[PDB]
CSV table of C-alpha atoms (C1' of nucleotides) in Angstrom, one decimal:
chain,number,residue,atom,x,y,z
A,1,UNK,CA,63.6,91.5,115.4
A,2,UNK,CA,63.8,91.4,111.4
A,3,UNK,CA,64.5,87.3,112.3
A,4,UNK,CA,60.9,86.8,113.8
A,5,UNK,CA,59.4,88.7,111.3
A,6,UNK,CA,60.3,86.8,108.9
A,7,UNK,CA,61.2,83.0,110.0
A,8,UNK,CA,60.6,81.6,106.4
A,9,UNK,CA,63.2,83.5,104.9
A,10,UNK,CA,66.4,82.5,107.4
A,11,UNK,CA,68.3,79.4,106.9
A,12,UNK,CA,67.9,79.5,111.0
A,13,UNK,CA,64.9,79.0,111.1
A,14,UNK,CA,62.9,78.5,107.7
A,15,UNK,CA,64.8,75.3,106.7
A,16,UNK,CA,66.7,73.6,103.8
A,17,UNK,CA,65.7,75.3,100.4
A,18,UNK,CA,64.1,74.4,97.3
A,19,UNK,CA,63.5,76.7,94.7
A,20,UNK,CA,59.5,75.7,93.6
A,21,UNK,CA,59.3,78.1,90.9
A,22,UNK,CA,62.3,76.6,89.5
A,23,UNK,CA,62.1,73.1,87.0
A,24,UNK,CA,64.1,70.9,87.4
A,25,UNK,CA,67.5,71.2,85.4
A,26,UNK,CA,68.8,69.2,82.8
A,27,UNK,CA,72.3,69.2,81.7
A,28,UNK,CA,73.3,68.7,78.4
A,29,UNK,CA,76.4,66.4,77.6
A,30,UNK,CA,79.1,67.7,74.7
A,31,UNK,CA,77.3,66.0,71.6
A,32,UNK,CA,80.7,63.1,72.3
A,33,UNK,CA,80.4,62.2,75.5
A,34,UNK,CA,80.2,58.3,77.4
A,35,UNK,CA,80.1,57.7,81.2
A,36,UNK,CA,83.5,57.9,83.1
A,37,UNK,CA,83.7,56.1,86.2
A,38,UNK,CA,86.7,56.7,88.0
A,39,UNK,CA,87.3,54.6,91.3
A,40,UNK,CA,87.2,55.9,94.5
A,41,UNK,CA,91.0,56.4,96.4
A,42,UNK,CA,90.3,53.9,99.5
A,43,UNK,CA,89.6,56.7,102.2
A,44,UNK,CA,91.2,56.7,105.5
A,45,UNK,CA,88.4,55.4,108.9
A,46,UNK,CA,89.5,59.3,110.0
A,47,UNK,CA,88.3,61.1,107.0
A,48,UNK,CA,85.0,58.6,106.7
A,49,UNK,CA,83.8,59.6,110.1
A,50,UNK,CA,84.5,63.0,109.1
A,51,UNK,CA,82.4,63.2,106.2
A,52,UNK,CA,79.9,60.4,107.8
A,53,UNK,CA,77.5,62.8,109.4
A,54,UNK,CA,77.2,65.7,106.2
A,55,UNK,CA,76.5,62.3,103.8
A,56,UNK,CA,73.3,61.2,106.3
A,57,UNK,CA,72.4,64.8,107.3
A,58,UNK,CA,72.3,65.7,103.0
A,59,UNK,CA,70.6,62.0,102.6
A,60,UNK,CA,67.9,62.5,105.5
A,61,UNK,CA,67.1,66.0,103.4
A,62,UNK,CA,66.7,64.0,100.3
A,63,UNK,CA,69.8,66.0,98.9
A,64,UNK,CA,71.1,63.0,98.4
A,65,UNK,CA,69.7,59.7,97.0
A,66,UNK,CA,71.1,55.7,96.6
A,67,UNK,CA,71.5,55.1,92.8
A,68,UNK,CA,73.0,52.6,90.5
A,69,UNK,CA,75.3,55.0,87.5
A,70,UNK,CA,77.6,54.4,85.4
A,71,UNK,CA,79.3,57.4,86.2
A,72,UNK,CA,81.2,58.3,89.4
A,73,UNK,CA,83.2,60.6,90.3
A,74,UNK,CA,86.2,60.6,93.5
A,75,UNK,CA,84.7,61.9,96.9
A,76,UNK,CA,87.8,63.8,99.4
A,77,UNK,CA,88.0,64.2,102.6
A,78,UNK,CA,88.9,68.5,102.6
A,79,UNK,CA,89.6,69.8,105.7
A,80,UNK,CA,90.9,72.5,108.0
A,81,UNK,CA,94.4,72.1,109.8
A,82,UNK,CA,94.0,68.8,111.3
A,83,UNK,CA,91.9,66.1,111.7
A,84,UNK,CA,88.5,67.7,113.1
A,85,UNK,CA,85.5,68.8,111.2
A,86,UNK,CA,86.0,67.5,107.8
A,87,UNK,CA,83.4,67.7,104.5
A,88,UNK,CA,82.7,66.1,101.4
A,89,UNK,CA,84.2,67.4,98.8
A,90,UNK,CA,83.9,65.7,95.4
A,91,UNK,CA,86.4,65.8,91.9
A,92,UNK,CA,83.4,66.8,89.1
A,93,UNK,CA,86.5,67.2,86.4
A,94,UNK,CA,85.9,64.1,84.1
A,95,UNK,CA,82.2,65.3,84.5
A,96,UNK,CA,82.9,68.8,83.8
A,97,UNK,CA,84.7,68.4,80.7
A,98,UNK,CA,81.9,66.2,79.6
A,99,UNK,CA,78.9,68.4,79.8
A,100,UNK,CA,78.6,71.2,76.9
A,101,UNK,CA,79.2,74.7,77.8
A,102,UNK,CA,77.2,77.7,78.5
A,103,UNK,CA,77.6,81.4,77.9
A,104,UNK,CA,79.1,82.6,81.4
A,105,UNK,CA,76.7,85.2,82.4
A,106,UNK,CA,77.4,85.8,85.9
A,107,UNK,CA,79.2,89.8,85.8
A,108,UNK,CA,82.5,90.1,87.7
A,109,UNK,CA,82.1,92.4,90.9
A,110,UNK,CA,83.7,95.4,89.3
A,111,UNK,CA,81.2,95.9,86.9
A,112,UNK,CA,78.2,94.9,89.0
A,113,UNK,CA,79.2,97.1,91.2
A,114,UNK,CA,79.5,99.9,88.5
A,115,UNK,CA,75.8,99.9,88.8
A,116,UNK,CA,75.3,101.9,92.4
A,117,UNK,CA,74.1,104.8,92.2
A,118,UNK,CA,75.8,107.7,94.7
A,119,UNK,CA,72.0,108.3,95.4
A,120,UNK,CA,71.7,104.7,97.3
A,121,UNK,CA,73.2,105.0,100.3
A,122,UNK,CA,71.4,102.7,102.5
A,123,UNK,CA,72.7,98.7,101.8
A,124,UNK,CA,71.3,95.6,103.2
A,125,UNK,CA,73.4,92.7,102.3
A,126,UNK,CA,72.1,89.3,102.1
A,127,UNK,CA,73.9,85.8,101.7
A,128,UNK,CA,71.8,82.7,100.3
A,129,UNK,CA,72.9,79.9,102.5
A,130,UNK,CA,73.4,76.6,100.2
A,131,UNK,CA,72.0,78.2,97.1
A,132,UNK,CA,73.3,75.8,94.7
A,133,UNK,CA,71.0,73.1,96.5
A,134,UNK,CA,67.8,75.3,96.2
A,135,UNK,CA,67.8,74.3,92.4
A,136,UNK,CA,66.6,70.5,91.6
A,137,UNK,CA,68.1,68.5,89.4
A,138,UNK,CA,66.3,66.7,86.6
A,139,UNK,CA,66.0,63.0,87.4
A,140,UNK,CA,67.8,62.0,83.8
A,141,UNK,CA,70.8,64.6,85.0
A,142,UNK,CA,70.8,62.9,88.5
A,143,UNK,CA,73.2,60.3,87.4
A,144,UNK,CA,76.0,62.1,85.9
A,145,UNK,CA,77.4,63.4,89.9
A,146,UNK,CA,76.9,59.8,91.6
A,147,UNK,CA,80.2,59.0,94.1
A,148,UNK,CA,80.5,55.7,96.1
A,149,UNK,CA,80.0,56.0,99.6
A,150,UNK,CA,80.5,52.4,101.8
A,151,UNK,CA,80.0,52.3,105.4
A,152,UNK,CA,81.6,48.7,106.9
A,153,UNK,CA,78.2,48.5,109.0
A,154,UNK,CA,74.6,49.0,108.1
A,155,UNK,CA,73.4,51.7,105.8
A,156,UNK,CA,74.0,52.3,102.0
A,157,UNK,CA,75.5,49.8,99.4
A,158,UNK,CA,77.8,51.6,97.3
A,159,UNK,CA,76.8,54.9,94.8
A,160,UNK,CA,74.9,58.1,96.1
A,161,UNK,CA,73.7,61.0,93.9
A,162,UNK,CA,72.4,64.6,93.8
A,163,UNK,CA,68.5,65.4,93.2
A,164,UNK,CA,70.4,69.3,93.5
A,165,UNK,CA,72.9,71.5,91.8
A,166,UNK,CA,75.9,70.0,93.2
A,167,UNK,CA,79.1,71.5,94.5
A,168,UNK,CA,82.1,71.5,92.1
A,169,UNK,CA,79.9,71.6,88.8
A,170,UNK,CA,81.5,74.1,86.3
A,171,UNK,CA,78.0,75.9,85.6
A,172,UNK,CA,76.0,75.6,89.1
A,173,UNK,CA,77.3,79.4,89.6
A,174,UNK,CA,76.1,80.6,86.0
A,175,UNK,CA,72.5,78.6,86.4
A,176,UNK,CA,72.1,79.6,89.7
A,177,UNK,CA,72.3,82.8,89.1
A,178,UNK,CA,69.8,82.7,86.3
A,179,UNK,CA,67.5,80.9,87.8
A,180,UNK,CA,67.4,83.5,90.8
A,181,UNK,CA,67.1,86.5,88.1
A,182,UNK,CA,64.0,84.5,87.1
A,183,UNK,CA,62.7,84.5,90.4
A,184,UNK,CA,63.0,87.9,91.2
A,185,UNK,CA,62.4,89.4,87.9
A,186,UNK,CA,59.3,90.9,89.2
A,187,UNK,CA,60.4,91.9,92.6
A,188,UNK,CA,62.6,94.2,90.4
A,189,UNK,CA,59.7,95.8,88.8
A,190,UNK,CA,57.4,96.3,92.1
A,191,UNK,CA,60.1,98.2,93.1
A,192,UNK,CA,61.6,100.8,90.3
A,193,UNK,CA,63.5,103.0,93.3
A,194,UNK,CA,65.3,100.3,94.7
A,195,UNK,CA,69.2,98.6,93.3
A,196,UNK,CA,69.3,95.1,93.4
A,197,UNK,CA,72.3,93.7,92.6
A,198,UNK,CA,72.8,89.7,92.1
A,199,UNK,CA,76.0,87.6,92.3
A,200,UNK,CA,75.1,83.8,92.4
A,201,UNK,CA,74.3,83.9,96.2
A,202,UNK,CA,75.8,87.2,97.1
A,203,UNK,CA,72.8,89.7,97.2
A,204,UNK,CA,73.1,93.7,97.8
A,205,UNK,CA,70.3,95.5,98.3
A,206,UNK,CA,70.3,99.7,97.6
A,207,UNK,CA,67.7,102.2,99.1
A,208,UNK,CA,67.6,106.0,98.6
A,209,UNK,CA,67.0,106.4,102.6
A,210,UNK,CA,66.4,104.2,105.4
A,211,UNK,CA,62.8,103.5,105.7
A,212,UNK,CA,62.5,102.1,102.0
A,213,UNK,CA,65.4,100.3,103.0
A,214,UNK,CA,64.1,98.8,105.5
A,215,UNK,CA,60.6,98.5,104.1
A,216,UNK,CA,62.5,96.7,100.8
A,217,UNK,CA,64.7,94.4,102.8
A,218,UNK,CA,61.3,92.7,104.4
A,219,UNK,CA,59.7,92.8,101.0
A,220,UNK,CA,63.1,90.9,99.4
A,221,UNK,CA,63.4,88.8,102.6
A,222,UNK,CA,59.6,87.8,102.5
A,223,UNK,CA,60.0,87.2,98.6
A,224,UNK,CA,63.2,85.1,98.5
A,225,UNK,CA,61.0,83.1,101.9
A,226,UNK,CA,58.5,82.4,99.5
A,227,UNK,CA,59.9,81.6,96.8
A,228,UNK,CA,62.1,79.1,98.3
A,229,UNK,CA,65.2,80.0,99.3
A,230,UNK,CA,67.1,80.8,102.4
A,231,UNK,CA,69.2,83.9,103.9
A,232,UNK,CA,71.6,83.6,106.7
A,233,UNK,CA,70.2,85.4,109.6
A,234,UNK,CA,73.8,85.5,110.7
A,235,UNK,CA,75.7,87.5,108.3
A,236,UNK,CA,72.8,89.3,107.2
A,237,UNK,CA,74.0,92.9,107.2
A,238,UNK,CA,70.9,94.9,107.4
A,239,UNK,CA,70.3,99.2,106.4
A,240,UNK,CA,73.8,100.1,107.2
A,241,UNK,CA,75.4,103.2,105.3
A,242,UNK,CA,78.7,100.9,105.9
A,243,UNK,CA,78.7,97.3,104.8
A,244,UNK,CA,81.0,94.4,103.5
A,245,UNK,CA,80.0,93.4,99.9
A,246,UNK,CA,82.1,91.1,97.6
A,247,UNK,CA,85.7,91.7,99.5
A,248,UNK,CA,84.7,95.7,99.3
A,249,UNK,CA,83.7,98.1,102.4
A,250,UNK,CA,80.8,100.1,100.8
A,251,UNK,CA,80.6,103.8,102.4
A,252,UNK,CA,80.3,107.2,100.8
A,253,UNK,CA,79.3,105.4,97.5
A,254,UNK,CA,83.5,104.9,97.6
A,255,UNK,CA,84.6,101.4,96.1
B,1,DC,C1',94.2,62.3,96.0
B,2,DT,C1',94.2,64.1,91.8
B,3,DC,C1',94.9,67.7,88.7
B,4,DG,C1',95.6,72.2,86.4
B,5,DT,C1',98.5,76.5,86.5
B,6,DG,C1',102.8,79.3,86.7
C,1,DA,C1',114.5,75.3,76.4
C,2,DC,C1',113.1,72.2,79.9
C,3,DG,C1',110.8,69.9,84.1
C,4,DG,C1',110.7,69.4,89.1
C,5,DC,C1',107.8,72.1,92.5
C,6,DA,C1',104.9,75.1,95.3
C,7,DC,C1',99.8,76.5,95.1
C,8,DG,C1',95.2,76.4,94.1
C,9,DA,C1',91.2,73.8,93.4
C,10,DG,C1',87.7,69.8,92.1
DNA sequence: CTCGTG
DNA sequence: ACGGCACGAG
């Protein structure tokens, strides 16, 4: 019943994220940089209904806000093999190469993986569900992702914007990332005997046996809960000797 | 749809 | 030495 137990901490059931520990975050433009606005490719009725229900869903959560900028960037209509269940997914390119760079410090999954221990045996693996919108964005940053968004009938007038780390921004892996090392800086230090190893949204959790394992996994999911972000109780792998972590199979401390 | 990569 | 062309990705 680890989902009962602990109702703040899964997407399920605790709600959309916010990270309250975490200020809001300003982005820095390269010390050239104007506004772009790049017009949106006229999008088919298909792909608008598509994407129609994710805009007002993100908009009713406040993820997304109405807003007058003179940057915009193109929204698409990306989708699976068809014409059902679409998503908005927008071009940040002109934005990207806009906004000044940042040391990458997220590891690659070879070498965070390099630090397990043969003596950890017991993994709970966790996935943050929307992670990038747990972080909020500064209200001067705000304007720099706007997109138009029109709607024949009643409802919006022409740009929308992100009050969150948005999708498709170059550093939203890097500053996630950081910002979730912040938060569990001292989870890390009430728990010396425990391996906790951190890749943007991807979490792996590493216990000598399987009661600290399992007595760890409610202290992470109860701190992440608090904190202000959000597991998925679905994937959720929980004190297995045998689990699926970043495209390996973890068993016998092999790969 | 628009790019970058090879 | 090109430069059209899958392929991936915002």
């Amino acid at each position: 019943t680890w989902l009962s137990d602990f109702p703040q901490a899964w997407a399920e059931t605790g709600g959309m994220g916010l990270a309250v520990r975490q200020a809001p975050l300003i982005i820095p433009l390269k010390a050239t940089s104007t506004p772009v606005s790049i017009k949106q490719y006229p999008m088919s009725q298909e792909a608008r209904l598509g994407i129609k229900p994710h805009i007002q869903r993100l908009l009713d959560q406040g993820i997304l806000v109405p807003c007058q900028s003179p940057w915009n960037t193109p929204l698409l209509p990306v989708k699976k093999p068809g014409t059902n269940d679409y998503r908005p997914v927008q071009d940040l390119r002109e934005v990207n190469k806009r906004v000044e760079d940042i040391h990458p410090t997220v590891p690659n999954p070879y070498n965070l993986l390099s630090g397990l221990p043969p003596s950890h045996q017991w993994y709970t693996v966790l996935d943050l569900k929307d992670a990038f919108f747990c972080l909020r964005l500064h209200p001067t940053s705000q304007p720099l992702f706007a997109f138009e968004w029109r709607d024949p009938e009643m409802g919006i007038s022409g740009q929308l914007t992100w009050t969150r780390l948005p999708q498709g921004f170059k550093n939203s892996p890097t500053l996630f990332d950081e910002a979730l090392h912040r938060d569990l800086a001292d989870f890390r230090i009430q728990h010396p005997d425990l391996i906790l190893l951190q890749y943007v949204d991807d979490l792996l959790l590493a216990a000598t046996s399987e009661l600290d394992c399992q007595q760890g996994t409610r202290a992470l999911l109860q701190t992440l809960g608090n904190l202000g972000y959000r597991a998925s109780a679905k994937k959720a792998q929980i004190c297995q000797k045998q689990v699926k972590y970043l495209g390996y199979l973890l068993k016998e401390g092999q790969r």
